[PDB]
């Protein structure tokens with residue numbers, strides 16, 4: 001649960017992402033894959049990537065970063081009223097991709113890391129607080145659907 005002022009911060013931060021969605025999406029995925037190499041094994045289409053240089057050169061990885069962040073941005077713009085948008089993603093990630101909730105924690109922290117890396121000094125303490133709460137809400141509502149499905 002976020003206040004109106006917290007949502008305003010979230011959507012202000014998101015404007016930084018929307019100026020370069022592919023560059024942010026690429027870096028989020030690279031941070032996820034290099035920090036937590038077990039996550040790469042869930043992607044049949046990226047498991048061939050052995051080095052970060054190959055990851056950086058991969059246009060398909062940048063494409064997938066765009067898909068991921070476009071979906072997250074659509075959810076965030078709902079300011080918590082995201083049941084219809086979140087349900088299919090929860091279902092696909094539990095039943096088809098088999099993504100443990102832990103990996104959603106990993107990517108949440110990676111988003112925070114990338115924002116500080118690309119906007120040093122321009123991602124303030126209030127903005128970090130609001131973004132973190134928004135990603136926690138997203139993860140918590142996914143977790144509820146995972147529990148319904150019995151997925152661990």
Ligand code: HEM
Pocket residue numbers: 039040042043044045067068069071072088089092093097099103104107
């Ligand atoms: C911010 C969180 C994330 C969002 C919004 C997101 C969004 C999406 C979307 C929109 C798709 C394509 C449609 C679908 O299959 O449902 C996708 C595919 C996928 N997601 Fe996620 N995702 C997230 C986190 C993750 C994480 C943490 C992993 C694994 C570590 C992951 C693994 C996958 C995989 C394996 C695919 C299929 C890729 C393919 O082969 O084309 N997702 N995701």
